[PDB]
Amino acid sequence: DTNVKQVKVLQLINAYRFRGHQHANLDPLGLYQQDKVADLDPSFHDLTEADFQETFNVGSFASGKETMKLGELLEALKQTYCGPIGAEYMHITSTEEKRWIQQRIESGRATFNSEEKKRFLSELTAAEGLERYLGAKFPGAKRFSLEGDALIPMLKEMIRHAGNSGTREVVLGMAHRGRLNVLVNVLGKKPQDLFDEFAGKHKEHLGTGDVKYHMGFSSDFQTDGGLVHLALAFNPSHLEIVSPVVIGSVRARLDRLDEPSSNKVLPITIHGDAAVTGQGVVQETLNMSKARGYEVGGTVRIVINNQVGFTTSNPLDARSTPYMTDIGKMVQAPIFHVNADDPEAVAFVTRLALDFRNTFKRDVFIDLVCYRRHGHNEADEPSATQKIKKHPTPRKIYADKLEQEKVATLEDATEMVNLYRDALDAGDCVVAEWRPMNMHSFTWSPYLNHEWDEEYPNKVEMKRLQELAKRISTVPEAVEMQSRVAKIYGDRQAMAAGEKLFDWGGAENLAYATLVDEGIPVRLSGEDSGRGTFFHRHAVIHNQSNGSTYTPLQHIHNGQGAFRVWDSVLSEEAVLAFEYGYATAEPRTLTIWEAQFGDFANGAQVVIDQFISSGEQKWGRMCGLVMLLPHGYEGQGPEHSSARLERYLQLCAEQNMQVCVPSTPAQVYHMLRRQALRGMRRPLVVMSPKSLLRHPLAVSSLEELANGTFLPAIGEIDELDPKGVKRVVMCSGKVYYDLLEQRRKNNQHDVAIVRIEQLYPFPHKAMQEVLQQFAHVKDFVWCQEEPLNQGAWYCSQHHFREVIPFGASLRYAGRPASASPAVGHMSVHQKQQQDLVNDALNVE
Amino acid sequence: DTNVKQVKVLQLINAYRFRGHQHANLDPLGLYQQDKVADLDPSFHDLTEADFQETFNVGSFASGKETMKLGELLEALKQTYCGPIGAEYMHITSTEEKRWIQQRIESGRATFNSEEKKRFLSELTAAEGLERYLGAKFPGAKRFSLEGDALIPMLKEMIRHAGNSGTREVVLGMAHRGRLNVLVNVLGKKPQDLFDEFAGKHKEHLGTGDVKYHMGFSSDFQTDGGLVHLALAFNPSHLEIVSPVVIGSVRARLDRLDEPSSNKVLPITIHGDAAVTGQGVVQETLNMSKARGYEVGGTVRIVINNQVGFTTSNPLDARSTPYMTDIGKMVQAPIFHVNADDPEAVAFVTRLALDFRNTFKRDVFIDLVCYRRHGHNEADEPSATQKIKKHPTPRKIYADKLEQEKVATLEDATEMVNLYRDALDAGDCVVAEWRPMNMHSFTWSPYLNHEWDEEYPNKVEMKRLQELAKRISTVPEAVEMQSRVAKIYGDRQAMAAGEKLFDWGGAENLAYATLVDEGIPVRLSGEDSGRGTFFHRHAVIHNQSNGSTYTPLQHIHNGQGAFRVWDSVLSEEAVLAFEYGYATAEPRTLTIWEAQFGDFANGAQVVIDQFISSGEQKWGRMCGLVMLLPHGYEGQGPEHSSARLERYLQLCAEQNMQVCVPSTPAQVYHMLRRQALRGMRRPLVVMSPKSLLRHPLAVSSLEELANGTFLPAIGEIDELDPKGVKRVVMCSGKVYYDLLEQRRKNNQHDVAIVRIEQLYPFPHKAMQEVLQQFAHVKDFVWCQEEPLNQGAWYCSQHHFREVIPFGASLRYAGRPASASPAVGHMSVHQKQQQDLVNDALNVE
Ligand SMILES: Nc1ncnc2c1ncn2[C@@H]1O[C@H](COP(=O)(O)O)[C@@H](O)[C@H]1O
Ligand SMILES: Nc1ncnc2c1ncn2[C@@H]1O[C@H](COP(=O)(O)O)[C@@H](O)[C@H]1O
Ligand SMILES: O=C([O-])CC(=O)C(=O)O
Ligand SMILES: O=C([O-])CC(=O)C(=O)O
Known part of the structure; x- marks a missing residue:
């Protein structure tokens, strides 16, 4: 009669482990809040209430605890599951994973010491000081301000915790926003060169270059476990295509090891706001995240849930999914919703995610919900409601919290801001752990600045x-x-x-x-x-x-x-x-x-x-x-x-x-x-x-x-007398053999055929060496089996009209241009095929 | 002391509602079976056992039932959740959906009458008779045999049940396989024309055509609720791109109605085997399936889980996800695993899915697990183990079941096969409900066979x-x-x-x-x-x-x-x-x-x-x-x-x-x-x-x-004397204004500029009408701001070299070709920009 409420609150606490995360507080400004937060979620709704002063524990199992009240149970548990962080994990069916996360986030909260608190406030203070300094010098630019500020401390914390667990090279691909902040304050790119390319007139390479927020960067990082060779992959203006790039990069870095111990190489990926659920590349790549030959034990991929979509606000059902990262329920992968208002929580969560990926070898997500202070490039209009102005900066609230925690005063944080601005003004490297690079990690040293006509040891015994x-x-x-x-x-x-x-x-x-x-x-x-x-x-x-x-x-x-x-x-x-x-x-x-x-x-x-x-x-x-x-x-x-x-x-x-x-x-x-x-x-x-x-x-x-050699342009293989030859046919693909199966079929001697095995590097030597035997003939053709738009007919003016002799001409043979390159019906296909082959051999 | 086992079996039956589906039997041949089927799933594993002869029911709630034993409970419930169908539904958090599915699939099994059983066996017998007849006449072709045979009866059953719930036009897009079987036995394409285009020499349209398994087809279908205007969307050789096409088609058919009552228009989509989890288009489209302006209340999209991947067998972890359709846990959408061994089950499941989509307006999946008898085009090799030969046909086992159910004998099914072969030999329309088409549904009747120079009422008051x-x-x-x-x-x-x-x-x-x-x-x-x-x-x-x-x-x-x-x-x-x-x-x-x-x-x-x-x-x-x-x-x-x-x-x-x-x-x-x-x-x-x-x-x-008009090629807008003009500049895009902001800047009179506002339909009239005022000048140029590969410079030989006069010449101005069409750095960009503009105006 009294244990039925015991098993009933066990039922409700299991169902509160399933869906406790939507009752949680996640928005750093408070506009992600829904009204469907008290519907079978708490104790008070269905069949239980307060004012009992008695609720026993798990019973015969010796937890060593003093659990006295279901109100105390939910108040202690809302401070775990429903507090600064939400844990979307109970839907995974693998019970070892469930009991492992239960052992982590319920029984014990990892309370941090004073020095780690100081370095978190210092580093995110440095992040926001960086972006305000960038606004101070350069007023109008493609800046892509981070301003959520939780990304920098959790990146550096996860790099430190991966160093303590022995991960020698961890590479991260990420979207356009939050680029420069991680380039400066995490990897340690030279800030003076960054301000130079903001100021422009830069001579980085002989190539055509790219905008300053696309060039990724390699660096060497020092942790308490050793050296860490961490890189940032490149990225075009397209978004979300970079996570298969970075999983390709970590599988390349695992095959250069002797053994694929998948903890020693880590991919991170930072995703966009409406692109981890928008773009369809992540479906394929986290599908691919457990296939053999493609898996690296998953990845710790992180979603900056900006709660924007570059125009979108937050209504109820204008949101396409309930959470902006529900994709990680495709595979039964845990999701972790973390705010930005207290990076103690984001440190706890990225430690949990990295421990998960290194223990059970499957991808983890980080739902990093945070706001967007400034715009991409212009005003913060199409998101109408701006509570952001009266919302304080993260360094302000976090420094005020640790001032209330008797750690860091106003003098300390002010000295941190002033040190950091002086460090940026110096042009010195910001990160205190960056190192120079040795030559052996520069594996591309014999693979630079070549041309296509080199000699490679082609001859085989x-x-x-x-x-x-x-x-x-x-x-x-x-x-x-x-x-x-x-x-x-x-x-x-x-x-x-x-x-x-x-x-x-x-x-x-x-x-x-x-x-x-x-x-x-x-x-x-x-x-x-x-x-x-x-x-x-x-x-x-x-x-x-x-x-x-x-x-x-x-x-x-x-x-x-x-x-x-x-x-x-x-x-x-x-x-x-x-x-x-x-x-x-x-x-x-x-x-x-x-x-x-x-x-x-x-x-x-x-x-x-x-x-x-x-x-x-x-x-x-x-x-x-x-x-x-x-x-x-x-x-x-x-x-x-x-x-x-x-x-x-x-x-x-x-x-x-x-x-x-x-x-x-x-x-x-x-x-x-x-x-x-x-x-x-x-x-x-x-x-x-x-x-x-x-x-x-x-x-x-x-x-x-x-004894065969490299051949770009194979000339005539049969025997033909070039004095009587009135036509040569330059053609690539199977159509040669088609022409050959019409030339030796109708024993036509006054036309030779020349293949062009290679097209794009304009074969100058190879074509002129195989046309000195057929130079006096004037009218050449360029057959193909492709339509007139298709093929290599819009490479003709580039070099087919210089391979041609002086007193000579070119004309076309091929299929006439159609939208479908091949017609669907076989009869008309062979009809125009045979007519085209017997049109290419015309002068007989 | 005795109710603790009551609440314990309530706990285990809830956890058996979560993950009872992997203990279920789904493979029609029996090679999808895993060994992890008895791990916290049944009663016998954790803390409960048999030989009790007592287990009470829900208790005070008057179910009206006689539930006597937990062994009887699990034996009755495995015949519901774990039997021929699995129901992946408990993970949806919306409790109305959960209790609705609980009211459907456990408290009552929809037992079918004799005539529906007869029409299911008749129709799938017709399906397999169709594909064996196709093999009989035409031995080697791109056939894409269905051979799973459950698709035809559940399609026709869902069309009937949508007719009884008033869905006037239901359109389905689908992949390449199972094409011809649904074209014949569901929609009712003319079989004689299908055998004619198998035999070829067909004159369907003046266009270039397509292969016989790509042309979709519209038809009118008769149910017991009225006429149903059902269509089959087109499809290229690419797969999985057709489901956003078909959701576009149903949103077009909802906006032509007065009101978007989303039950009256239904999209179905049949997906491939390894492409509902392979291709990334389905991520975007079922993401898009609840966004405003894009949603149609979801769709009943169906996965033919062939258990093949055109080469792949079924090992344990070579499978990228545990089920081949786990995507529908992105949105909290129910999934239903259904075998092919008993189409009573697939009738029950597609009735459930259609009732779900018409009631609660969200997409449903159908996991249709079935085998693959023959190949695509050649031998069934890279899937090694072939139990398929000793596995019987579905019509054999289903007819033998209904013979054991005292419904249909061997004479009946044999008469069905012989009727169906005679119907195919006649060339008569197979489906008994196909109708001719009226003109009003042919909405494209004034939009056929036009050319681009028609007159449209451009002048506005x-x-x-x-x-x-x-x-x-x-x-x-x-x-x-x-x-x-x-x-x-x-x-x-x-x-x-x-x-x-x-x-x-x-x-x-x-x-x-x-x-x-x-x-x-x-x-x-x-x-x-x-x-x-x-x-x-x-x-x-x-x-x-x-x-x-x-x-x-x-x-x-x-x-x-x-x-x-x-x-x-x-x-x-x-x-x-x-x-x-x-x-x-x-x-x-x-x-x-x-x-x-x-x-x-x-x-x-x-x-x-x-x-x-x-x-x-x-x-x-x-x-x-x-x-x-x-x-x-x-x-x-x-x-x-x-x-x-x-x-x-x-x-x-x-x-x-x-x-x-x-x-x-x-x-x-x-x-x-x-x-x-x-x-x-x-x-x-x-x-x-x-x-x-x-x-x-x-x-x-x-x-x-x-009073403005349609202009494809706007000539000179300023005043210039064409007698002294020695250059004209044909250029499209903004570069005109750039040239204009250099021409009137340096007051150069001997060169005119002509824009080309339209490129692809080769503007003959428009260009020659604006060059009769500048015909005597010989050297023309084609400026552009794009690189030399880019632009419209490989449209030059098509019509720029016929717009040119006889005693005249053309040359090029533009950026020299680079891989990146724009260099990333602004300084060299404006440098080559200004040099190109002052190169385009040269003869001064
Ligand atoms: N494809 C490539 N060509 C030239 N250099 C490369 C290439 N990939 C990486 N590197 C260089 O390799 C160094 C970093 O080493 P890793 O991170 O092992 O690629 C940097 O100097 C890169 O510029
Ligand atoms: N873009 C189009 N051009 C020409 N005919 C079309 C087009 N779309 C649909 N139809 C025709 O419309 C009829 C079917 O009607 P509906 O299903 O409403 O498109 C068939 O005759 C189709 O060939
Ligand atoms: O601008 C882009 O390409 C990315 C974008 O729309 C967003 O992340 O909201
Ligand atoms: O052949 C295709 O394009 C489709 C394919 O690979 C499959 O469905 O297994």
């Missing part, structure tokens, strides 16, 4: 090459194959014996085997490329008799290159930024990316347009990814057909990318080793075709791989 | 125009303005009196007012465009004294056009597909889309490349969106600067889009009414600039709007 073929083809008899897989491997065993010529797939993973034994690893991580998309790689043989897998490239010899294929989850726009961040933080590993189809790789456009094709000219950051893109006009579809090639050729600028179209498999051999061990890291977008995978003219002998 | 200005400018004195807002509105009141010329923003919402009174509504729904992105629209005046809003375009007169501005959530790639689906399902409303910046609109590339610029040529589907894109080289940033213009001009094909760059605000007036009330609906991508918003040469008199 033929005996070792045949041994690589016979090791990647001979498969142990435990892992039972599939019949078509067995036919492919028997055929490439015949290719190893010199019987059959190389088709595409055998030559391509032979190129993999040529890389991985010398010591240069390869990470291919495409979508669904463990077997290839067109059934033409099969680098993972599934044992269809047992179920386990065997990779015949991970068993060549010990001391090899670390080759790991990862079939991606279906991201296509945040797997590519992952392979960017893996590619720009390790120059050794040849990181290639294979889409499922051509224009199915159109999702990552921001990653192509603003990272990989603008990285060198904006930041001076190098990247050597390879984009294996399918590209074909067989007629299988309108957008199963082709990636947009001008979307990799309207980036036509100063040897930045390099698009190249391998026709022969000898070309894909030389292109992957041209990218791998050259010395320059600039992006490939290779047009890895479809019809040439199963084609009986894949002309690739093993003679063409040992 | 000047008195009514000035009245529109004085109504959009005069604001009632309750809604107190902001000071800069008050200065903008006072300035445009001066513009109304003919005192000040029109700048951009006053002329642009004057164009809005010109549209909305005549009867043609405008939906501008950009990101953060309720006030404009560059503070230059202010179409929502926030009362900064009270907090509520006032829109001076929603208060012109009664009987107006419905004008509704919606500030988007930060989507940029699924707000645009929403405005596509709103634009392609209502031709009346001028639906424009304003990005925050130029290349911040690069996220939606798939929506631009495969819907709006390929819609007319692939499907023959028309769309008239407008893309308000900022575009400027002030030097504010490298990618705050410009949208890629060739990314709207490498779509150069057959009058599909129309890019146009308004210089004067008179041009933006004529362009928005050129798109609005012309009669053709083809997409604009307008380059709405930045520096011209605050520019003292915004030459737009009210003379230029009443």
Whole structure:
């Protein structure tokens, strides 16, 4: 009769552990408050009340406590769950996690000593002093004021606590706002250079530069556990694309270690206000946060919940979700709502989150709710109600709290402000732990300032090459194959014996085997490329008799290159930024990316347009990814057909990318080793075709791989007398073979065909060396199988009209331009295909 | 002593309501089973056991039940929560929803009568008979076999139950697989035409066509509640981009109703296997599923959990999330796991989901777990373990169940198969409820087959125009303005009196007012465009004294056009597909889309490349969106600067889009009414600039709007003698005014400037009519402020070299090509800016 209220308050306290966080006080100004705060939440609503003076504890379990009253229970517990911080954790089903968080945030509050309180007030006082000093000198600029002020102490506290738990390199990517404050007061960028580039006239690099709030920065940081090599990743004007970049960066920093002890490398990510729930890249990347080959045990990603949206106020249902970070209930990841009014709470919360990520290896969020004092660039209008003016600064209330706590007086905080302004006026480095950088962490020292025509050790010893073929083809008899897989491997065993010529797939993973034994690893991580998309790689043989897998490239010899294929989850726009961040933080590993189809790789456009094709000219950051893109006009579809090639050729600028179209498999051999061990890291977008995978003219002998060389522009392979030749046909892609299968079909001698295997670095030497044998002929053509807008026809005026001789002319052959690059119907497709091929060969 | 076990089993049954679904049996073949199924889940694990023969019921609450045993309790309850279906619902915090689902799925199981059982077995028997017939006639094709077979009966059951609850038009977008089965057996496409286009040689439209599994289809369906106008939206080869398209389509079908009673229009969406958790568009669109101006009360979106990922098997932690649809815990939306082994369960579940969406107005998911019998196109290899061969077909087990239920024998089901094969052999329409279509639902009847030079009633009565200005400018004195807002509105009141010329923003919402009174509504729904992105629209005046809003375009007169501005959530790639689906399902409303910046609109590339610029040529589907894109080289940033213009001009094909760059605000007036009330609906991508918003040469008199006309190519506005003129400068964008502010600065008479306000439909008449006054001059130039790759310089060979006279020449002026279109540093930016302008004016 009296224990029914005991179990009833156990029920209500469990349901108050579920949804106690919406009764909590989170807004630093007090406009996040809803009216639905007393509805089955407290004791007083349903069946219980006060004025009892008795409530016993957990009972027979010896807690050692003096729990006397349910009013005392809720008053002690609202000071834990419902106070400055809310804890959205009870929905995780893993009971070890639940009891671990119960052991942390209920039984014991981590009370801080006096010196840590002093350093928190000092550091956030320094943060707000920095931004007011920036307003003092430079009045009007793209400043992106932080003004929430809780970010700096919790960043430095989490860096200190990661130092005490041994995390040697922790990299953070973040959005545009709060940039300069973390660059100065956390990492320790040189403030005088920052004020110089505010004042402009800066000579940082020979590239085209970028605005001052995009350049991230590496630094060395001293904690009580040792040195910490912490970096800040780059960022374009787009938001929220940087978290797959930074998870790529930490997987690159984990593979350069001997062992992926995932506590030793930490990604942080600071997200925007309405972009952790706005942008769809975070769905893919925290989805990707537990997939094998992609996970780093999660990340401590932090949401600055500004309670703004660059125009939005806070009504009831104009808010798209109830909290602005509910995404972290996709995976059963804990969320922690923390205000800015008391950074004791944010220290406690980021200690809890870092302890969580280092113990149970899953991503944690930090809901950092705070306000926005000034604007982006102009007035704080479209958020109407401004309580912000009569709301005090965080250093004022926190210093007044610690003055009431008998720690720091007005003289102390005033001396801190004046010290900090003097430190900024000096131009000295602000952070007291910044160090100079040694050369070994500067791993990109042999990979700077090259041109595409360098010499790389292309020639391979033929005996070792045949041994690589016979090791990647001979498969142990435990892992039972599939019949078509067995036919492919028997055929490439015949290719190893010199019987059959190389088709595409055998030559391509032979190129993999040529890389991985010398010591240069390869990470291919495409979508669904463990077997290839067109059934033409099969680098993972599934044992269809047992179920386990065997990779015949991970068993060549010990001391090899670390080759790991990862079939991606279906991201296509945040797997590519992952392979960017893996590619720009390790120059050794040849990181290639294979889409499922051509224009199915159109999702990552921001990653192509603003990272990989603008990285060198904006930041001076190098990247050597390879984009294996399918590209074909067989007629299988309108957008199963082709990636947009001008979307990799309207980036036509100063040897930045390099698009190249391998026709022969000898070309894909030389292109992957041209990218791998050259010395320059600039992006490939290779047009890895479809019809040439199963084609009986894949002309690739093993003679063409040992003594074969790098070829950008393969001229005529047949025998033709150039005196009678009245036409040459410059054409790239499969259409050559189509033209070839019409030229030798109708034995036409007065026209030669020249392929152009590489397009973007304007092949001058390679084209003029293969046209001195066909120079006297005037009228050239540029065939293609793409439409007239598509292809490389708007690269013609750049260099096709200088490859041409003087007394000579050019004209066009190709499909006439249509919006769909391929028509959907097969009959009209082959009709205009055959008409175009028999139009390209005209003068007979 | 005996009630402690009562409250303990209440605790364990609540915790079994939370996580009872992972103990449930869901896989139709039995390879989704985990070992962590007995861990605090049942009674037997923690503190309770069997062999009691006593357990009382809820107690004093009169349930009217005979609940005798906790073993009986769990055996009755596992037959509800843990049986053929799992119910992931308890995590929603709204207690009305919880008690509603508790009232549905536990206190009563909806047992079906005999005839509904017969029609379910008949319809799925027809589905599997269809796909085996397709395999029988046509052996090798892009078939995308359904073979899970539960989708057809639950679709038709939900259509019937929506008919009984009055839903007049329900549109579904879906992925590639399961396409043809729903086209035949649900909507009722003509099967003979489907077999004809399998056989090919089809003449469906004059456009370029698309593959047979992309063309969606409209149909009229008969239920017991009335006619239902159900459509199937189009889809490119990309996946998962179609759900914002279909939510755009239902918001268009709700605004054509008088009132948005959201039960009467239903979106369904069928998602892919690894793409409801893979692709990031669903994050944005179910985020967007409760925002005002975007919500339709949610949607019943359905996940075909194939348990494949086009290569992936099912290991433990290779699965990125525990369930393949955990996304619907972003919003607190219920999820329902349903197998395929008994479509009684899927009927019960889709009735529950449709009752949920029609009652409480929030999105529901359907986790439809089922297997994949055959492949996409080739062998079922990279999923190794194939239990599928010894697993029976669904019609076999379901017919054998109902034979055991004394309903349908072997003769009955065999007669159903033979009837269905005869119906397919006839070429008759399969569905017995398909109807012909009337003309009024064919709303696009006056909007077909036009060209861009039609006449639209451009001339406006000047008195009514000035009245529109004085109504959009005069604001009632309750809604107190902001000071800069008050200065903008006072300035445009001066513009109304003919005192000040029109700048951009006053002329642009004057164009809005010109549209909305005549009867043609405008939906501008950009990101953060309720006030404009560059503070230059202010179409929502926030009362900064009270907090509520006032829109001076929603208060012109009664009987107006419905004008509704919606500030988007930060989507940029699924707000645009929403405005596509709103634009392609209502031709009346001028639906424009304003990005925050130029290349911040690069996220939606798939929506631009495969819907709006390929819609007319692939499907023959028309769309008239407008893309308000900022575009400027002030030097504010490298990618705050410009949208890629060739990314709207490498779509150069057959009058599909129309890019146009308004210089004067008179041009933006004529362009928005050129798109609005012309009669053709083809997409604009307008380059709405930045520096011209605050520019003292915004030459737009009210003379230029009443008697002003449509101008594609404005020639020289100043007075120049063409006999001495030795240069003309064709240039578009702000650079004209830059050139103008250098031409009249240095009083240079021998060079005229000609703008080209519209680029993509090759302006033949407009350019040759403005060059007959400057024809004798030979050397023309094409200035621009964009780099040499960027701009419209790879539209030059298309028509700039035919606008040119015969005895004449062209050369280039512009920025030399760089990867970043704008350099990041302001000093070198103005340096090359001034050098380029003084290079464009050379011959003096
Ligand atoms: N792709 C790259 N090209 C040139 N330098 C780089 C690249 N990535 C990193 N660095 C340099 O590497 C140093 C930092 O080391 P880490 O943090 O290991 O990349 C800095 O000097 C960076 O500029
Ligand atoms: N943008 C469009 N252009 C031409 N016809 C359309 C368009 N959108 C829908 N239709 C036609 O409208 C009919 C279906 O009506 P509704 O479902 O209301 O669009 C079909 O004949 C469609 O082809
Ligand atoms: O300006 C941007 O791109 C980001 C933005 O809209 C926001 O975070 O509110
Ligand atoms: O082939 C596609 O584009 C879709 C895909 O990978 C899947 O649904 O597994």
